[PDB]
Structure formats: C-alpha cells, structure tokens
Amino acid sequence: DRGVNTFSPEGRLFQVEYAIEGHKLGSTAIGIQTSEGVCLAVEKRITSPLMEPSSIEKIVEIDAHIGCAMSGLIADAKTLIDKARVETQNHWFTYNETMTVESVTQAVSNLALQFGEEDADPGAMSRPFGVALLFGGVDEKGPQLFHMDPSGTFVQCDARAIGSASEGAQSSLQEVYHKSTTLKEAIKSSLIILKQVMEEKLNATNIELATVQPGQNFHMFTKEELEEVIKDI
Amino acid sequence: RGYSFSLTTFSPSGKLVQIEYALAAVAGGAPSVGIKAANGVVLATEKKQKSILYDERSVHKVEPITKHIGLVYSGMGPDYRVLVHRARKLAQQYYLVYQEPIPTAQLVQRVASVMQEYTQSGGVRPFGVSLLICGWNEGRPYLFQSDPSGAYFAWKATAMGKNYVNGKTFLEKRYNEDLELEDAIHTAILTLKESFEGQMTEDNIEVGICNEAGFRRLTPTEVRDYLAA
Amino acid sequence: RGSSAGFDRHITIFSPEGRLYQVEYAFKAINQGGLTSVAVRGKDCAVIVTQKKVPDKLLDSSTVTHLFKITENIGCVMTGMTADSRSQVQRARYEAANWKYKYGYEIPVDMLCKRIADISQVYTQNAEMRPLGCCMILIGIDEEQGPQVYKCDPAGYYCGFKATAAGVKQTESTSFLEKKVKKKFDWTFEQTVETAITCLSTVLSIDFKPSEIEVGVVTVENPKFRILTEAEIDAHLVAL
Amino acid sequence: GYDLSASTFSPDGRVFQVEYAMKAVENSSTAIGIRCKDGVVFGVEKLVLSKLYEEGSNKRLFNVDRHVGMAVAGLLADARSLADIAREEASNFRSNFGYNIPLKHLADRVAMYVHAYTLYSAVRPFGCSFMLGSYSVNDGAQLYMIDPSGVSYGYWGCAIGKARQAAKTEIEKLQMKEMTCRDVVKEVAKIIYIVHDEVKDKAFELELSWVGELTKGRHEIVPKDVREEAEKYAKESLK
Amino acid sequence: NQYDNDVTVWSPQGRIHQIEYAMEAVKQGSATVGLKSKTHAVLVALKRAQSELAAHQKKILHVDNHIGISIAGLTADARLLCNFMRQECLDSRFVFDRPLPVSRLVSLIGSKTQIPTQRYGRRPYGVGLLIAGYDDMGPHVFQTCPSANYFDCRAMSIGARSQSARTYLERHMSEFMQCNLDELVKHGLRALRETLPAEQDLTTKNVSIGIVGKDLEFTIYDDDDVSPFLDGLE
Amino acid sequence: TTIMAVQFDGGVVLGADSRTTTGSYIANRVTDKLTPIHDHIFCCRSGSAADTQAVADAVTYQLGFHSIELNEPPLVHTAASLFKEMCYRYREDLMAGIIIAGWDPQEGGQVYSVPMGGMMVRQSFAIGGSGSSYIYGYVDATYREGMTKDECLQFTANALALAMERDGSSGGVIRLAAIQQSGVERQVLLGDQIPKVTISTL
Amino acid sequence: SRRYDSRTTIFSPEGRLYQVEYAMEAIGHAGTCLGILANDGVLLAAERRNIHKLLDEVFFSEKIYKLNEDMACSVAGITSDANVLTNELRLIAQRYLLQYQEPIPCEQLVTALCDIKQAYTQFGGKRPFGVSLLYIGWDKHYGFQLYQSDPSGNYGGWKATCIGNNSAAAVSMLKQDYKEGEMTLKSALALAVKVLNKTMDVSKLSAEKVEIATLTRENGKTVIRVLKQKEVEQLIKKHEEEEAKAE
Amino acid sequence: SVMSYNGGAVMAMKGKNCVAIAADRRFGIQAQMVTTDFQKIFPMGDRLYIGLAGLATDVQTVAQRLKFRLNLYELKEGRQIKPYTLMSMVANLLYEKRFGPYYTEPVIAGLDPKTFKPFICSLDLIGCPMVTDDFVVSGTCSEQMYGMCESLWEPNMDPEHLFETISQAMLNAVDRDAVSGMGVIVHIIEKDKITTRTLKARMD
C-alpha cells in the first residue's frame, strides 16, 4: 500500500513507529553509571535445558574501553557492532589515540534512517533496524553510558533500562539510584531489580554481567565470581 | 527510467492471458495466405484502403529482408515495422560474420527469440502480430510462421487474420503436392476471394513470389493479368 | 462491447479484445485544442492552410503560429497539444540535420515521416510514459516524384495522401474533399488554394477575414518553403 | 482512478495532474506585466502575512541575466528551481556563442524543460507560472508567459495570479502601444491597487521593476522616489 | 483518500498532503526563539524534560565561526543538514579565503531541500531550523521550512505552543534594535517563559543560549554559564 | 598553402592556391581550399587536410541547426566562436589554421583569424599558410585604408602570385571569392592570366 | 510504480510460491514424455502434439535437441522457454570443454542449468520458466544416466520416470513392470510402447503420434539415433501381436 | 622475431579431386629441442583440416577457440561447415585482435561436402585470406618450399604422385632449416579415404 518513507497525519514515519514496537518483545537489559565505572546486565532467557547457555552473547566488547549490550533483533545488531569496531580501529590508525564513547554513539546513530528503495545505493537497507543499544566506557572525562534508538536519537544516561519490562524497571531504578553510589551497591541493586522482574530464578547461568572502570579494561564476570556474588547477596 | 517487473504472469490455471490477448488482437487483422509449391512460394494479402483519398503506392505489406527472403504479416503495422527492421539487422550481421546469405530457418529462430524476449522482460507488452516468412536456399523453398509468444512452425499452406478457420478448411481440399507456382497463384487468389465482401482489383491486394532467382512483389500490371482469370 | 480486466484503462497493455484503450484516448486528446488543418497537393505545388483563432486581443499574434519549418524545403503543420507539438518539431529538426550530416544529401519526406512514426511506436509499448497527444502533416518537393504530403498519428501509423484534413471536423471535412477527387485531378494547378479555403469554409461557415488563416507553399519553380503574406492571402480571399 | 499520474489519459483525453498543478497557481496572489514602446514594467502585489518578517523577504522578481527580468506566481521553491535552470541556460549560451541570448530562445528552452515533467510517473509537474521580459536595440521590448504545462506565448500585457479575470479586464482599457514606461509605471500601481482585495488580505507590499532604454537594457528595480510618487498617484486615483 | 501517501500527487485542490504532514511533524518539538538587535543576534531554546534521569539534549549547534543554528523536529535529519552546512562553509573558506554570507548559505540549503519534494519514492526533511549569523551587513535571523521556502525575520519562534511567544514578540518588537545584549537576552527569556505551562518556570538546566555579534564568535552557554542571565527575571 | 583575406566596405575578399603536396610530390594540383560554412560565410583551410575537412563539417552542421532554430541568418562572430571552441578543445591532436570571413546584416564584412592554438582575433586583412611568410613586407608596404572591390581583388591576386613564385609548396591557380549582400562570386586566375612580376636578368 | 507490481517472488501465508505452483500446473497439460534406463543404454519416447496434415517434417525431430556428443533431452510446457534453455545448455557444455579439454558430466550439466532456473524464483521481479526436462547421457564415472528437472529448480536421478499429461498413471504402471538390473534395450522398448499405448486417450498408436530416440556405446563412441517410422511400426505390430495372443 | 621462436613449417598441395597437408614435428625453444611429437594439424571436419604455425601457445589457443565455435555452429545449424565458410570465420576471429594479435599463420585444406571439389587457402596473422590453386606454405623455410613447389608441381595429379611430390618437397625444404625437422607427417584427404603417414627424416 504505502512506501517505506511515508509520514502519517501526525508526521510519525510508520515504519520507524513499528520498528520501535519491535522492542517491547525483547529480554530486559540494564546499565548504571557510577563515579568508579559502569556496569551492564542482561537476562539470557533460556528456552529449553538442551540449549548451551554459553552460546548466548548479548554483551560484546567494542574496544579495550567500550562495551555494548543489545536487545531486539540480535541478527540485526551484528552489522552495527562490526561497523562500530571498524570505526574505532580507523580512529586509532589515523590519530594514534582512542576514540570516545560520544563519538562512537554518534557515528553508529548515523546509520539509522539510511534506508529506502529508489536511488539509494548499489546495496542499501530496505527497512530500519530493530535493535536498541547501550554503550559504556571510560575516556578523558570518566565513565559514561549512552542509549540509542532505531530512529537515530542517542542520549546520555546514568541509569537506563531497555526491554519488555522497562516501564517497571525504571520505576524502581529511579528510587534506587542516587549520585553517591559505589559500583558494588550498583551491582547489588542491578541484580535485585532483575530478580524482581524476571520470570525464572536468578541463578548463575541465565544472566550476564560486565564492568569497565578507570583502572582496568573491559572485563566479563566469571561463573566463579558471579556465583560468589549471587550467593553473597 | 523504466519498470523492472514483468507484466505477463501465470494464472491459477497456468495460462498467460497477455499472450492470449495479443493473439485475440492478431485474430482481428486482415487476411493473409501462403502456399508452397514445387518450385516456389506465394504470399497474398488484402490491402484494402479506407477511402479513395489514401495514396496506395506509399505503404506496402509484403517486404523483403534479403535477396532471397520476404515476409507478410497480420495484426499491427507499427509493430510489424519494428520486427522488419530488426530482421534486416540480423541478416546483415550473419552475412558480416560468415560471408554467406543467412538461411530461412536461422532467420526465423532469431526473430522468434526477440519476440520471446518481449514476453518476460520488465515493463513491456508482447507484440500484436504474427508473421509469414518465405525463402529459398540450397534448391528448396521454405515457409514458416511465427506467433506472438515466440513459437514457430513449418507449413505447406496456411492462413492468418480474419476467417482463418474457413481459410484453412478450404485450403486443405485443393492443395496438391505436385502444384506448379503459376497454378498455385490461382488457388491463393481464390482463397482470398472467398471472404472479401467487395470486388477484386489490382490495388485491393498485394502478392509476392519467391523462386530460384530471388524475392519480388508482383506489379499491378501483372496482378491484372492474374486476376483476369 | 469490449470488456476490461485488470489495468487495461491505465497502461498500454492488451484488453480482452486486443484494443489498447490508452491509445484510443490520445486520439480524443487531439480534439482538445479546437482547430482544424487541411493539406492539398497539386500537379506542381503543395499547400497548407490552418485556422488562426486567437482567444482575445492582448496576445502578440505574430507568435501564435501552427506552421513550422523543418529544413529549407520541408514544412509542417501541427494539431493537438501545443507543448507536445513543439517537442515533436524539435525532434524532426534534429533528425533532418543528422541525416544530412551522415549521408551527404537532404532527407526525403517519407524517410522523415517514418522516423517520427517509429519514435512514437515506442511510447505505445513501454508503460512508464504516455503517448504524445498531437498529429502531424508534412509537405515537400521530391526531386524524383515531385510534391508529397504525409501524415503521422499518435499510434505510429504514417500513410501518404492525395489530400488530407486533421482536427475537430475531420470526418465531414474529408467527406467534402471526397467529392472533388472525381475529375480534373482536384484542380491540379497553382490555384488549389481555392480548393483548400473552400473546403475549410464549407463546414465552418466563417468566410474568413484576411487574417484568420495561415497558408504555406512549396513549388517546383521555387522549392523552398514560403509563408504567404496577408496581402497575398487577402487577394485570394477577395476573389472568392 | 485517473487522477494519480501524469502518464494516464482520462477517458476524454485530459491530464488531471497538470489540471491540479494549475489550480495551485489559480489561487495565488496576483502579478502583472505591461509592454511599452521603450520597455517593459513588472509589478507584483507582495503579501505580508505577519509583522515579524523583514520587508524584502519572499521576493518574486529575479534577475535571470543582465538583460532579462522574471516575475513568478505559485510555489516559490519550484520558482527558484526554474530561476536557476534559466540562469544556467543563459550562461551556457554565452559561453558557447559569445553573445547574449534572445528572449525568444530562452523562453523556448525553459518551456521544453517544464514540459518534460508532464510525461512520466516518476515526477510531477511544476506548480508555478512565470513571466519574462527584456529589451534589445535589435527587437525592442518583449514579454512571454509560461504555464505549468509548458505553453509559451507572446503578449502585450499579462495578469498571472488569482485576480487574473479582473486584472486583464482593466488592463485592456489602456492603449499601451503609445505610452512610455514613466507613464506606464503609474498605471501598473493603479491597476494593482484596484485589483487588490482589502478584506481577506489586510496589508500588502508593492515592488516594481523595469527594463528598457532608460536603463540601457539592464534589468533593474524601480527607484524609491518613483515608487512613492506612483503610490500616491494610485491612491488619489482610487478615491 | 488516495492522495495522502505519495509526495508526487496533487489533490483536487492543488495541495501536497505529504509536505503538510511533514510540517505537522515539526510542530511536535519544543519551542525556540530568536531575535536580533543593532549588533547582536541571539538564540534561546528550551531543552525538553525527557525523563527523571537523562541529560536533556543538544538543540544548538555550531556551524562556523559566525553561524549557528537551533533545531526542532527529527534530530537525525537535523544533523544530516548540519553536516552539509558545515561542508559548505569549509569549502567556501578553502576556495576564496573568506567567510560565507548567511544569505547564500540559506539559498544553498533551500535548493537542496526542494529536490526530494518532487521525485517518486522520496520524502521531505522533517525538521525546521533557525539560523543566526554575522557578516558585513549585520545580523540575520533566517528561518526554514520542510517545504523548501525560507523567510527573513526580525524575530521568530518555532515549536509547539509558540503562538504565545509570537504574540509577545510582535507586541514588544518596537525596542529590539536599540536594546543592549543583556536587555536583548532577557527579552528572549521572557518570551520563552511564555510558552511554558503554569506549573513550571525557567530553572538553570533546561535552557540554552547562543550569541553571535560584531566582535564575538558564536558561543553556547552551558548549564551554569546561563546563571548571569536568569538572575533578574522576577 | 597560401590563403589570404582583406576587408572592404560591404564585404570581404578571399583567396588561395591549389596545390596539395606529400613531401616533394604533388598529389593534387586543382584543390579547392575555400569552403562554404553557410550561405554567406566561408573559411580558408591550411595545415592538415583531414583535420580541416572534419572541423569544417562539424561546424557546418552545428551552425545550420543553430540558425534554423533561431529563425534568422547567423553571425560571423558565432561561426568564429564555434571554430575556436573546437580548435581549443582538440588543440593537441589537430593541425588547422583557419581564416573565417563572411557577411552579416549587423556589421557587414569581418575577418577573423584562428591560428593553431585556438586563439581568436579580428583583423582587417589576414594571411596564413606555409608561403605567407614571404609576403609580410609586401602587405605591410601595399595596404592602404578604405579600398574598393576591384582594388582588393587586384591586391589579393598580386600578393598570391608573389607567394606562389617563391614558395616550393605553393602553386597551381588562384581562386578568388568576393562576398557581398547580393551573393557569392567565384573566379579562377589560371595560366597566362597570373600577374607576372619582373624577374631580374643578366 | 508500486500500483502495477505483481510480486512474483514472495512467500504465501502458508510458505508457498504461487507462481511456481501455477507453472507446475501449466506443465501438467503438455504432451506425454517418458524415459527408461537399461543395461546397454537409455531411451526417450515423446508424443507428437501437432498432427495437422498441412505441416512439414523438415527437422530430424520435434522434442529431442541433441545437446552434446554424449547427451540429449526433451521438454514439456512452453516451447519458447524451452529454446532459451537449450541454447544455454549448449553454451555451458562448450565452456566446460574449453576449460578442461574433456566432455562434461551429466550431473554437472543438470546442476548448472538448475542454478539458472532457481535464480528466477528469488530475485529480479520476472516470472519463471514453465518447462520440465528429461536428460539422458553417458560419462566416464557412472555410465548411462537419466535425470529430471522442474520449474522450481530441483532435480533427481531416476530409472524410469515420466512427465506431462497422465504421468501419474504412467509412473503407476511403470512401477509394476520394471525390474532392476535385468532389463535390456528390447524389453525397454516393449514396455515403453505398451505404456504409451495406454496413457494416450486415443484408440491405438499411429507410428506418427510418437517419437523415439535411443543412446548406446559402440566402439568407444556414443551414438544418438532417432528411430524411424518403419521401425516404430514394426514395434507396434509386435505389441499388437503378443497382446492379442494372450487374450 | 616472435614467429621464429618455436620454429615450424606447414604445407598444402592440391591434386585432381584430392588435397594433401603436411607439417614437421619438432617442438623446441630458441636453440634447444624439447620433444619431437608436437601436433600442428587439427581435424576440423570429416574432410576438413587446419594447420597452424608460429608461436606454440597461440597455436594451441586458436585451435581451442576454433573448436569451440565450430561445435556451436554445427549444433545450431544441423550440418557440417564448408571450407569457404570456415576460412571467413577464422579471419573474423583473427581480426578481432587486430591490435595485439596472435602470432600464428593458418592453412586450410578440405573437400567440398557435395561436389568433392578441393580447396586450399592461407591467412596472414591479421586475417587476410588468399586462395590459390597450386599450393600454400607457411613457416620458417617458406622460401625453400617455394623453390621446391614451383619446380616440382604439376596439374591434375593422382594421390600417389601428390604424396610423392609433397613429401619430396618437405624433406629437402627442412633439410636446410636449422629450427625445423625431426620428422614429417602427411595427411592425404581423398574422397572416401584419409591416409596418414610418417616419413623418415634427419635428427640433427
């Protein structure tokens, strides 16, 4: 009936309005920014006990100081991840220094809306992407956490939650968060809310957690340390 | 810059109705007739002008392609002209490569390939014309027919246009295999005469022949003598 | 009468009868302007006449012309849509110049007509564009035959004539000219201007003034295409 | 279903897309032109919507070349596109042939460009009409007018806009063939003030331009003293 | 009900519903305000309250040393336009070793914006702008539209509920020329205060302020750099 | 080759020889180096025969189209500008020195030089070709302002005879062309009618 | 434009491809063709569809199309598409021979053609070819073979298949009279004649409503030979005799 | 020179309803022999052969492209090609590479498929066809076999005398060439027979 580019009586871009609805059917993720680093955490949502749980990777590493956590169409997110990696490596090659979380979020947001079906390119996209992202990292100003939408609007947050239970996850994050946290209380509360909202039982193989801090690199939690933390809680 | 999708598609029963409709268009042209004899072929058409104002000499329906091939049509004239032009080009390319005159069967195959290309490309309709090809090579006369779809046959006596059913029903009876070219002309003319609704004249019809010496369309002075009998 | 199935009346595809309705509509577009042309060829001359009805008197009527020059010895008269006809005249001029450049001599009238006709046949086949809604008439002197008069149409059909007539009153304006090719070769002498003006006036009842027509001329004595002046037109009109 | 494309004849042989792009013009504010012995004079009733804008915004008189003016009516974005095309046409002509382009040739070139947008489904026709005007010691004054369909005729005075009916009716009672620009300018001011509606539209701006022998063949804008006097005369005449 | 989908279809009234809808998109955004005096031009914007936790936005961007803009509408399209304007100014300085006139910049922007509105399978840029610059001829407050026509104005406000700011502006335009910079900016903040509902007053982190002038480049004022301007609005 | 043209009040006069060589052999001895570009415009050709023929043809075609669509006779300046455009675009592949002369209702007779390089200039009289270098002093000492048609014809014939009697690549007959508002005039000065100048004896 | 598009290359609400489903039904009504594999060679046997008296039998066959020195095929469906496919097959075989200086194997030929048939169902906007093919051949590795393709673009090796009209009953009766490994060429001809005699609605065969080709190896050479009318008549007489004798 | 880099010598002669073609076997590089069984004559048809001389890589390439095109032609038309038609096709193939050409000079010899009338012809590197009525040569000892054929040739010869003459010519021609030899093979294309022979030559 319509084309892909078609405003509505409210100027809304139907296809983007649908790609946004494609996100309320994903598994919840959570990021939180502290004065000592950032932490990301996402539910794995295992289907049946025959599926290997070490094969669900929803928190990848963009560079030695930036990590990403996605939700939506994990098949779509991979081109974005690849292009972000390539851009960071190009910036290193040219300027002999590390890129910034702001610049990476901005360069990735410029691929959104670049779709169409006539006089676009030799091989071009035919629809918008269906993935929301969450970047974290440290740079010359400290820990930062950004958020990206399929429309191409990126913001800077300190505690954001994306997914199918976010309208309930933020209602607790806004009460829990304060400007005087430490990363440890951050991790504890980020686990408590997950447990609060999930459908299964929060054990040490159906979740994921990583952290970046001014001293170290991007580091993923182990089934040893993770288990200890869960048990400790 | 042009459409890229097909305009001819399959139907729930497997038909191609655009080709069926191009055939319905062909079924409403003017009658054509071809008859292969022991030493030549004969093409005969109905060139009936709308009114006396039209200058008859300017436009012809029986055209040559090389020194030994000629064809007629039924259907749509503006499409017939495109087909004639491309057939002439095809014959010239063959002669350029092989330094030999093209045979009638190769000519018909290449023309039918073009007509088939116009059933599966993007944003075009099929031709609304069927052809009747004539030729002579290696001591033998040929006579083919090409359809709007791209399928060609080989005949001894056929008929196109309006009233083709009765045309071939009458054509089957008289046809002999020993028939000379001069006595075949009478049958070709007579077949046309069955459905004319008028009076025959040296400007109502066109007639072309092809024998050992090449293709040529008869002149009205000769059509007069042939019509006298 | 003729049924329809699908997108028949919107694009150039066959109807269940093989009729191409979208080309029968450009013929009706021809009758939109509201003019009428008449061309007559004689034993040594070809003549064009054209109605000249300007709407009201603020236009510079020295610019409202339906007569055009293609080469020195070829002239033309259009009927139908104005901008379409301008584009067709430009195309004919380019074709006529390219022929001379390629082959060293001047293009004949029938060759030019056939070129324009096969250019239009393509609009009848591809579906992304529309046919041009205009007719064309050409005249000229052939060094071998003499006077020639040809006419195209939006379908790609390009017959040749003894005396044509295109426009709104085509049928009756040709029914009149039918009766006069009986004898005397339709007055085959330089005064076929009389025949043309009479045929244009008989079914219009205007008895035109000295400036509501345009006439053009080619002759065997002088081959170039000339446009006769108002005084010359007036003298013929006065004689009538 | 015949109203959606410029590649579909109606069952009666019409093109409704061009017919609609013409309504687009048939409801826009009026502009007139008057040819004279010495030269041409353009005049447009420029509408001021709100106080906030600076006077001088949304000009409708351009300079296509150093001897050609231009007045527009309709969608101003399409108008600016056409003005760039015309500037392009004149500059190429001078670089090819070494002298200035005739108005007859320019109008022919721009009308062909406009008409090319009336045949295909991939584009839409322009929604603006315009007038040209020049002056050359060779051919004197000139005046043309191109439509959204691409037709271009020569005139003595034209009235594109919404009040074309009332504008043309009053301009025909003028005897322009003997007047001069100084004597025409006043008439343009008067007729525009007459045709102007002062109910729907409350306030309007007036700008004028001319090209003739007094400007040595260069298109200009009417100086401020002449304009003030013209406005006063028009007001006095109106009562 | 068949003319409201493509940008190359006229209605029986000679209108383009697609271009219309793309304008109704621009009305969704938060209001902005611009105005100019004898020697300075000023932009002031209202950063919208997105949520209880996120840093608000970026609504004013540098284009060049003398030009700055402020957007309302699709931010992706807005920064796509900003990149083109930046390249235009850079190209200018490379070829002629001088700056660009704001008028010629806006000409290029309009000519670029118009092309999409005519071809098949394309859509208009859904973003309105407000440009401010300084040149040989003084300040300029141009404004653009999704339909490619642009305007020139003494003072203009775009966004949702900007009708009240526009009324205040015209009602007080009588003194913008003579007024000083401090006086000029306050006139802007009052006008911007007009569009806000009853439950909210300007604070110190939901407003931005841009300034360009005679002896001064384009500058943006941060969260607590706008404090010297909001001290008197009683 | 020795081509020449001089300007008088009402039109110009053109002239040329007729010999086409190949090294030291005469391939054609009745060549016609004056070609009509339009009804009232001509051009003299020197240099490479194939180049000059091709450029004359292209310019002829362009100018005919231009004039038929503008609906008036064209200008000598327009012809010279088309020549200059082509000669400058292909300046490294072509070898052509042209002289354009004609008549237009707006300025009458003009003469334009386009030497190899693609530069344009208006002149009162112009000489070009391989043998033109032998008569520079003669045209400098003989020209006088405001001459008539017969004096121009005599001037051109004498200069061309002096060039042909010294240049080894020139000879044959003289071809003249006076162009005016009436039409074109072509004559040949062959054999014994070549104006003989006295050769020193003893 | 989008209004006139017909969308030939999309999925159905149940995972089907409607254009291919309709081309298969087109191929459903064509002339009967049948193949049979044996110990010493393969054979094809088609049915003549155009039987008009006024025709001409200039060609050595109507539906055979020798593709190479070792292979041959036969078609059912649309002749116009069949011609394109046959030209393509010849070009593929010659390109293989040019690159390797050996003849091509039959499975490689069939594969390279089915790729082209498949690329018409996934992108391009065109319609697909409405043609089914049978192939016969001989190569170094596997000897006598017999394949079959279809509009979608998938093939398969067989021992006795049949396409066209009433191919269902043809295969049904083929299953009960074919015995693997013991069939010779003569028993193959007998079974082919006796299957064609029934699966054709006419009263009895005519030796001109049929068309028969074989393939053998003789003296290290492949021979592809179309049988003649007299041979076919003799075979029909033999079939008539034995069948009559039983009852 | 490039066409003297591998050596070679081809020869064709015409008789009374019979043709004969011959070549040498040596394959070598500038001054050193590698093998002695190189093939330079190719069976394009039932009674239609072609012989190639020059650069050996181009000999092989041109033979393979020609076989490509001839297979396609005989499958499309339905019959065998004629000697005259084959010559035109080869000339077209060689002229397609007018700039950057193959270094090979072909020779054709066949019998008319319906009149059994002989045919000999040779082409130059660019595709210039010259048809003769006595004999053609090509290779590095062209002048030597010219001198032999002009003296030994007679009109209306039998196959026996034709074989004797072509063999006696090739032997003495290549006995005076440094980069040709190692044996000679002779094909005799009669009406119903094609006899092949190998002569005993010198191996130095």
From Swiss-Prot, chain B:
GO terms for biological process: proteasome-mediated ubiquitin-dependent protein catabolic process; response to virus. Phosphorylated on tyrosine residues; which may be important for nuclear import. CDD domains: proteasome_alpha_type_2 (cd03750). Gene3D superfamilies: Glutamine Phosphoribosylpyrophosphate, subunit 1, domain 1 (3.60.20.10). The modification N6-acetyllysine is found at residues 67, 168. NCBIfam families: PRK03996.1. This is Proteasome subunit alpha type-2. It comes from Rattus norvegicus (Rat).
From Swiss-Prot, chain D:
InterPro entries: Ntn_hydrolases_N (IPR029055), Proteasome_alpha (IPR050115), Proteasome_alpha-type (IPR023332), Proteasome_asu_N (IPR000426), Proteasome_sua/b (IPR001353). SMART domains: Proteasome_A_N. Keywords: Acetylation, Cytoplasm, Nucleus, Phosphoprotein, Proteasome. It is found in: Cytoplasm; Nucleus. GO terms for molecular function: ubiquitin protein ligase binding. GO terms for biological process: proteasome-mediated ubiquitin-dependent protein catabolic process. The modification N6-acetyllysine is found at residues 51, 200, 224. Component of the 20S core proteasome complex involved in the proteolytic degradation of most intracellular proteins. This complex plays numerous essential roles within the cell by associating with different regulatory particles. Associated with two 19S regulatory particles, forms the 26S proteasome and thus participates in the ATP-dependent degradation of ubiquitinated proteins. This is Proteasome subunit alpha type-3. The lineage of its organism: Eukaryota, Metazoa, Chordata, Craniata, Vertebrata.
From Swiss-Prot, chain E:
Pfam families: Proteasome, Proteasome_A_N. Ubiquitous. There is a cross-link at residues 112, 205 (Glycyl lysine isopeptide (Lys-Gly) (interchain with G-Cter in ubiquitin)). Proteolytically cleaved from a C-terminal extension in the course of the conversion of the proteasome from its latent form into its active form. InterPro entries: Ntn_hydrolases_N, Proteasome_alpha, Proteasome_alpha-type, Proteasome_alpha1, Proteasome_asu_N, Proteasome_sua/b. PANTHER family: PROTEASOME SUBUNIT ALPHA/BETA. This is Proteasome subunit alpha type-1. The lineage of its organism: Eukaryota, Metazoa, Chordata, Craniata, Vertebrata.
Curated annotation (Swiss-Prot), chain F:
Keywords: Acetylation, Cytoplasm, Hydrolase, Nucleus, Phosphoprotein, Protease, Proteasome, Threonine protease, Zymogen. The active site is at 1 (nucleophile). The keyword Iron does not apply. GO terms for molecular function: endopeptidase activity; threonine-type endopeptidase activity. GO terms for biological process: proteasome-mediated ubiquitin-dependent protein catabolic process. It catalyses: Cleavage of peptide bonds with very broad specificity. It is found in: Cytoplasm; Nucleus. The modification Phosphothreonine is found at residue 35. Component of the 20S core proteasome complex involved in the proteolytic degradation of most intracellular proteins. This complex plays numerous essential roles within the cell by associating with different regulatory particles. Associated with two 19S regulatory particles, forms the 26S proteasome and thus participates in the ATP-dependent degradation of ubiquitinated proteins. Belongs to the peptidase T1B family. This is Proteasome subunit beta type-6. It comes from Rattus norvegicus (Rat).
